[PDB]
Every structure is written in C-alpha cells, then in structure tokens.
Design a binder for this molecule. Structure first.
Ligand SMILES: Cc1cc2c3c(c1C)C(C)(C)CC=[N+]3c1c([nH]c(=O)[nH]c1=O)N2C[C@H](O)[C@H](O)[C@H](O)COP(=O)(O)O
Ligand SMILES: Cc1cc2c3c(c1C)C(C)(C)CC=[N+]3c1c([nH]c(=O)[nH]c1=O)N2C[C@H](O)[C@H](O)[C@H](O)COP(=O)(O)O
Ligand SMILES: [K+]
Ligand SMILES: [Mn+2]
Ligand SMILES: [Mn+2]
Ligand SMILES: [Mn+2]
Lengths: 500, 497
C-alpha cells in the first residue's frame, strides 16, 4: 500500500506506476544539463526526470528528482503531482485541491510523534563537522549566469523561536558558498526572517539554530510553501492533512526535530552579522538579471545525516509552468479564499493564473452577494485592496482582478476575455501607492522603485456597473454558451455525417 | 486556379486542401448555420459550405461560412487569408502584412469594363416588383439578434456626387422588410463621409448604392482595410491582383460592380428615414439587448446556384479578428514608417478581441532618440489615437525587439512582467472612444464618447538608454544551442516516449 503524502519514496513509485517519471541511467552533468532537461520537461508538460547517474556523484550522494510539481497530460490528470502531495485521486482538479486544504483547517491539528533513532532512515549515515565538504557534492548549476550552484530549491528550512512555542517550516533558495557555508535570502515579511529577528532581540544574532531537510513527506514540503498564520507550526497542520502525526527524530547538534524519513538532513547555525553576496538566480518571473543584490546571511553547516542512495528533489524556476506557479501561486490563492471568507467578502473562488507568472490574483465574485452590499465599484475596490495588499498573504500579488461568477477563473481563455473586454484602461484601475512592493517583480527590481520599496500595485474592476445593482442578461458569442443545449447536442451528433 | 480574382476558384483551392466541407443535408438558417460556424471557427476547423438551406430556391442561395477563419498549422494557419491575395498558403501573417505594404508602391490599376454577355452576375435580373427580401433564406446568426443579417461579408459601393471617389467597404446590414435593409453608417467611416456629401447638396434621402456578394476575394479583403480617404479601393485591388478588376454597369444607376459577383443588390440609401437596427452579436463576444439609415432595394441580379459568404462574429477567432485587426496593424505599420517611429512590426492579438495593438520597437532606433518613457508614450498615443487608423484600438503596448509579437505566449509574458500597473500606463482622456468596446457601451462613456484609451510602456527603463543583457529562463532561449541540440538528440535514449 503506497502513501505518497507520507513517504517521498512512495511518491516516486506512484509516479512510476502512472508512467510519469523517467529514470535516466546515462551520465548527466549537474552543470547546465540537469537544468535544461528540466525546462524542456516543464514546458511541454512531460514526465518528471529522475537522474540516477550524475557526473561527480557517489553511490549515496546523490540522485536528483526534477519537476516534483510540474504539470502533465490532461488524460493522467494534469495536476496529478500536486494531488499526490496530499494523498488525493490524481484526477482531482486544482479547484478541488484548494477546497480540500480549506477543509483540513477545520480538522484537529496533530503534532509530530518522536520515534526511536533506529526507525529513522535519515540516520543511516552521520557526518560530523570535520567530514562536511559541500563542494564535493554534485550540486546543480541551474541557469546560465547564475552566481553559484543552488543546493536548496525544494527542501525545508526549520527554525524555532527562543521561547520554543513556534517552529516554522518554509522553502527559500540556498546557494553553496564554500566547503561549509550556504547563503540565501532572509527578507521580511517571511517567517524565517521574523524568527531570526527574535534571536537577535535576545542577543543571539550570530548563532541561530537551523535544520535543512530534503525529501521530506510530500505533504510537509507543500505546507512549507504555504503562507499559514504567524505563530502556527506547519507540522501540526501537516498532521491534520495526513490523518496522523509526522514521525520525527532530533538533530545531532541542536534541539530541533526533523522528519524521520528525510533523504538528507543538514544542520548548523545561521548568522545575521556574517554575510555574503548571493545570486544572481533565475526566478519565478522568467529572468536572470546581473544585479549583484544585497548581501545575505550565512548558514554554517556543522553536521549532516543521510539515507543509502539519497535523492535530492530540485525546482528550476523560470517561464510558466513550474513549482513557483503551481505551489506558490495556488497556495496564496488558498489563503486568499480563506481571508475573503473571514472578512465577509462575497468571493466564490480565487486563483493565480500560470500565464501571468503568479503576479495576477483573480477573484470570482458572487453577484447576488455583491448586490446585497449596495456598494459602488470605487468603494468595493478600495475595501478589497485594503484587505489584501496590507497583509503577508498579498505580498507577491501586483494586480487583483475582479470578475463575475459567469467566468471560469481556472481557464485562462475566459480570464483574458473578461480582462480586455470588461475594464476600461486606467479609469477602472485603483492604484495603491503606499503598500509594500514585491522586490522580485522585474518592473520593480529594474526601476527606482527598488530603492523605495513602495507601491506599483492595483485592483482592476472587470465587473460591469449594472452587475453591482441588479441582474444583467447578455449572450456570450461562442458555440457552447451562445446556443441552446439541444442545438449544441444536435450539431455535436451530426458532425461526422456532415463531413468532418 | 486564381483564388484572388475568382470567388469560385477560392472555393476550389479550399476543396483541394481538404479545408472545405460541402454539407448536403438540410440545415435551418434559423440558428443552425450560426452554431456550426462557431464550432468550426473555435477549433480552427474546415470551412462549411451549406448547399441545402431550408427555404432556399435552386438559385438563392447557398452559404459559405468562415471564409477568413484559422486552420491547422500543417496546412498553413492563415491559408484562407493568403488565398484572398494569391499567396502561398503557408505564408505567415507577418509576410502577408509586408506584402500589402509592398503593393502600395505598385502602380494602381483602375477597373476595366467588360461586355454584359461575359458577366455571370447578370445571368438573372429582377426588376422592383420582383424583389422579395423575406423569401430569401437569410441567417439568424446569434440568439437575441434583433433580426436576420444578410450583409456580413459583402461589399457596399458608394460614390461621391462629383464621381471622383468610389468607396468599397463592409458594414453589417439587417433585413427590415421585403424591400429594405438597415445598417450602421457612422463617423469616421468613409461610407458616412460620402453620404454626408450627398446631404450637403440636398440629396440626403436618395443616395445611390450597390451591395455585392461573392466579389473577387482580393476586393473583399481591401473593403475591410482603412486605406486613405479619396483613394478608390478598386485601384489598389488592381495593383494587388496585377490586373484591372473586371466590372459592369448596374441596371438602375451608374455604379460599376464586379463582373463575377455571385449577387448584386441595387437601390437608394436615405439618411433621414431611420429604423431600429440590432442588436447584433459583435467582435468582442457579446449580444447586449440594447436608430440607423434605410437602404431601399430597387433591383437585383445573380448567378446560377449563387453563394452568400457569411461571417458570424463572437469570441476569437473569426473575420472580425483576422481581417479587421490585422489590416489596422498593416496601416499602423505604414503610419509608423511615415511618422518616423522606430517600429519593426505591428499586430493585434486575436486573444485580445482586436482591442490591443502591440508595437515591436527597435532598441537602437529608440536609443538614438535620446528620449524618456513619458515623452515616447505621449508621442505614440498622439500619432495613433487621434486618427481613423487608431479608432478600434483601446490599448497600445510597447515592447522590445526580443519579443515575437505574433506569438501570444510571449506577448502576455512581456505585458505582465515589464509594466508597473497604472504607473507605466498613460491615459488619453480627450480622444474619441470606440462605441462598440463593451466597457464603453455599458458605461456612461456611451454618452460622452471620449477617453478610456492608453499607451502601456513594457520597455525597461535602461532599454531607452543602452544595451541590457538578461537571460530568458526557458529551454530554447535559456541555454546554449549546442546543449539544446544535444538534449533534443538524446531525448529518446533517456527514456521519453
Ligand atoms: C515552492 C517554492 C517556494 C519559494 C521558492 C522556491 C520554491 C520552489 C524556489 C526555491 C524555487 C525559489 C524561490 N523561493 C523562495 C520563496 N520565498 C522566499 O522567501 N525565498 C525564496 O527564495 N518561496 C516561497 C515561500 O516558500 C512561501 O512564501 C512560504 O509561505 C514561506 O513560508 P512562511 O509563510 O512560513 O514564511
Ligand atoms: C471584415 C468585417 C469588417 C467589419 C465588420 C464585419 C466584418 C466581417 C462584420 C459585418 C461581421 C461586423 C461588423 N463590421 C463592421 C465594420 N465597420 C463598420 O463601420 N460597421 C460594421 O458593422 N467592419 C470594418 C470595416 O470594413 C473597416 O473599418 C473598413 O476600414 C471600412 O472601410 P473604409 O475605410 O472605406 O470606411
Ligand atoms: K510555510
Ligand atoms: Mn510559517
Ligand atoms: Mn475607404
Ligand atoms: Mn475599405
């Protein structure tokens, strides 16, 4: 019996059973080759590559699994890979996946369970400080012009507060610096930064304990990507999704708990006072820019542990569609739907289209609910923007687009139609000048707005004026919706006989 | 086969390409014609030729639908459009546009009168009391249309009182009763400009016209193109064809009609005698439940087994996008060259329902102007939105020369990643609005008819000044060609099926 949500290796096996994984046995260079193969597979929605013979590898360190949450063909279920991180039927839609995650918020949180070390495959091999050699690993060089090799693209950073009440799991990119050090972005408003600032506040900025875990339970890596509330430990919600506690063991060199079935675990201390230049790194909007960036904190690795024949999962970001659109975007959408429900807005669904590179959040609006409020477009846009852009859930989003409930927001052909035909350029767009800008957006990073970090965000009204007051019946001029059902069925029936 | 010159040769070349289905079973012109057309358009399928319409006579008529719809890439996807011009069927939309511009530099060839005996449009001739427009199997195209639309891919002919300008153009035309048709006749369209000349000398109620169906395909393409005022479209159609269009006189007035037209209607137009028109399903995808001039039909002439060509507008992609959009883009490129802007290409993406005009900028030419985003956006908007060529266009989008503007994947990528919402958009408040845009028609801007247009800057600030090298993070552009080729070569050996 396979349990893909609880075991990374069972997740591999079910993708094999669905012919959605290719074991590549010939020699592949971690320098560019891995990365280009991944981009080709993401962009035509093809099977996930599993590289078994990397140039420079040892028997144990490591294989690479690329594209762990890319899209695949509609026949097998196109979001199948996502659905298997949650233990759901491979044909489940992304609307359904979202509404499942919201149901699991109502279930009892189950905290992790400690198990004996001999039951943790992550403890099979252990390396102390003098045996750590990060430059000897077959780490990938993923994009032309990247500043280094990125070991950490699909692992889980684990940090805990000084008072021990909140342990955080999240994903952020991590670059190998030298034989013992990794560096990466630690920016507001992310929780990794909030926890580090709390270590600085009690005098320990140069010695923050961390763990970095690869090939965790798939449900854990997906909740690592999700912006749940401050103070809530990811592990307890992951337990609710699994229906059982995640099994964990303690680190060798600190008090943190790591999943027992991890492929690889790195441990150490993070310093906010000892910094290094990071990047460049190809990013979720499709670009490598040569900008040297701010200097970033340094992670010092002091121990590692791993399984026999260990597998590193990898994400290679860029043009749609990859994990930075299917996870970051759809998990912002999950929490955006939750926020509409708690603040009383009449939203049926939310979604971040892949074609818009996770910059556009579409809200599908219930028209009876909207009419009950007896409001105007100007007041509704302000209320919505104030809810979303002044909170952490809104951070990556630069344009919020409001459409009526006759639009399938999960179909980008319906969304681009409503966008160009139902909003007046400029006049139907409300600017928010004083809110936090998203620094990765290229129109921000490559402007003066990078110095100031405020504004450039908008709410765009694609709801007709009459739709705020009452019913408004119009015909949509295509085959499926423009003609009555009986005629559609008759044309579909006689299609062959006509001569097609 | 000369498909640019003969409508029946166009139908045959489509037969030879398996791009035409002769439908022989009985089909109702009430909704069924329309629905079949929509299904064909939307999956880029072969054009339906309806041979046995309920209510038809032997001669009046069949319907060809989807004459400038898209087809499979294997056959050439703009093949139908290339055939209107006599070009190879795999010619790209880029090459089609550039061909139309090269044809502006050839010598115009005015029409040539031929004998009435050699002219098929004269095979059958009806006099005034033999006109019965309600006995034609005219299509009822969209649910909630305000009536039956006979004129959707025919050619209106109007001439100035001095005889020096003959205009050919397309505009929708709805049957009102047994003798009368009504259509939109609006500024700034040449048909309104010419009608107003007749009103100015006291003949607003008796303007001669003709209406022709199944014209030479090159003529129906130019009829949809905004060429300059006072140029008779016939003369440029001649330059395109490499010969004069062959024409014959109308029975009841002095206008000349193409000799091979399937059907010709003749009469007088009145601007002061109005009737309710519409609603009609339109180029942006809607019928809304929301008073135009009257055309009096006084004579008709037609071929044996005549064929009415039909366009049914709606969602992308149909003739309102492949012709109206691309021919605005053709004239938009001509205006850039004439005004001196650094534009390599222009296109109106079909996905944006012909509301978006994308302009591909040459960065060395832009850098040579020593300008800013604010000043360039003003310069571009002032050229386009204040002239007839910019009439349908509500957003102009400026991109650099690394974007293929003919591929909508790269357009939407550039759009969302390279402009700051609002701050990088310049509103034009005092220019004329397109009254068909749904955001205009369903707001109080329907009554003012000004504003709601903008130029959106999608060129990075540094690209106005100098080189700017970044990597595009996909497979074919992100990696060296050698490595791209190596991966493609070994793809099957890895295990991909
Ligand atoms: C799935 C995923 C999420 C990335 C991500 C990537 C992936 C594959 C990469 C590694 C390919 C590239 C860039 N990533 C970063 C990122 N957030 C961040 O602060 N820095 C990052 O470097 N994220 C988002 C981050 O995981 C979410 O915002 C979480 O909500 C953070 O958790 P938190 O709410 O506990 O802070
Ligand atoms: C190809 C095509 C073009 C339509 C058109 C359609 C098609 C199929 C229809 C019939 C399906 C629906 C609506 N159309 C109208 C329209 N222009 C207009 O003034 N009224 C219209 O009703 N046009 C565009 C018109 O032909 C262009 O604006 C020309 O440039 C007009 O020529 P002009 O420069 O000589 O005035
Ligand atoms: K998280
Ligand atoms: Mn968190
Ligand atoms: Mn004209
Ligand atoms: Mn014309």
């Amino acid at each position: 019996k396979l349990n893909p949500a609880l075991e990374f290796r069972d997740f591999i096996q079910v993708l094999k059973d669905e012919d959605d994984l290719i074991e590549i046995t010939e020699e592949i260079d971690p320098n560019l080759e891995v990365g280009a193969i991944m981009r080709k597979a993401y962009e035509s929605h093809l099977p996930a590559p599993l590289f078994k013979n990397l140039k420079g590898a040892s028997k144990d360190l490591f294989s690479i699994l690329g594209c762990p949450a890319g899209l695949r063909s509609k026949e097998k279920g196109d979001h199948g890979r996502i659905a298997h991180h949650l233990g759901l039927d491979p044909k489940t839609t992304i609307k359904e996946i979202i509404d499942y995650l919201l149901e699991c918020k109502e279930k009892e949180p189950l905290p992790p369970i400690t198990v004996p070390v001999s039951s943790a495959p992550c403890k099979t091999h252990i390396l102390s400080e003098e045996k750590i050699h990060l430059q000897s690993l077959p780490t990938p060089y993923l994009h032309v012009s990247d500043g280094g090799k990125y070991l950490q693209t699909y692992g889980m950073w684990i940090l805990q507060t000084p008072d021990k009440k909140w342990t955080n799991w999240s994903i952020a990119a991590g670059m190998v610096v030298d034989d013992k050090h990794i560096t990466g972005l630690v920016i507001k408003p992310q929780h990794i930064r909030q926890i580090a600032d709390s270590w600085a506040a009690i005098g320990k900025a140069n010695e923050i304990p961390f763990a970095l875990c690869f090939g965790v339970p798939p449900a854990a890596i997906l909740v690592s990507s999700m912006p749940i509330p401050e103070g809530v430990s990811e592990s307890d919600y992951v337990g609710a999704i699994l229906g059982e506690s995640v099994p964990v063991v303690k680190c060798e060199t600190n008090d943190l708990m790591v999943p027992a079935t991890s492929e690889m675990v790195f441990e150490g201390t993070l310093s906010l006072t000892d910094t290094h230049l990071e990047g460049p790194f190809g990013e979720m909007h499709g670009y490598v820019f040569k900008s040297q960036g701010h200097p970033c904190p340094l992670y010092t690795v002091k121990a590692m542990s791993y399984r026999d024949n260990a597998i590193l999962p990898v994400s290679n970001p860029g043009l749609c569609t990859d994990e930075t659109h299917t996870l970051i975007g759809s998990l912002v959408a999950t929490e955006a739907k939750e926020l509409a429900i708690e603040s009383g807005l009449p939203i049926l669904d939310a979604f971040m289209p892949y074609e818009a590179q996770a910059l556009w959040l579409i809200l599908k609006v219930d028209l009876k609910g909207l009419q009950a409020l007896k409001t105007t477009p100007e007041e509704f846009c302000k209320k919505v923007g104030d809810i979303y852009f002044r909170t952490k859930v809104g951070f990556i989003v630069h344009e919020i687009i409001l459409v009526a409930d006759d639009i399938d927001i999960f179909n980008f052909k319906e969304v681009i139609w409503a966008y160009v035909t139902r909003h007046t350029p400029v006049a139907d767009q409300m600017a928010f000048d004083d809110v936090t800008s998203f620094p990765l957006a290229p129109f921000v990073s490559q402007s003066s707005r990078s110095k100031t970090m405020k504004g450039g965000k908008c709410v765009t009204n694609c709801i007709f004026r009459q739709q705020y007051e009452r019913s408004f019946d119009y015909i949509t001029c295509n085959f499926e919706k423009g003609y009555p059902k009986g005629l559609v069925d008759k044309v579909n029936e006689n299609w062959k006989r006509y001569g097609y």
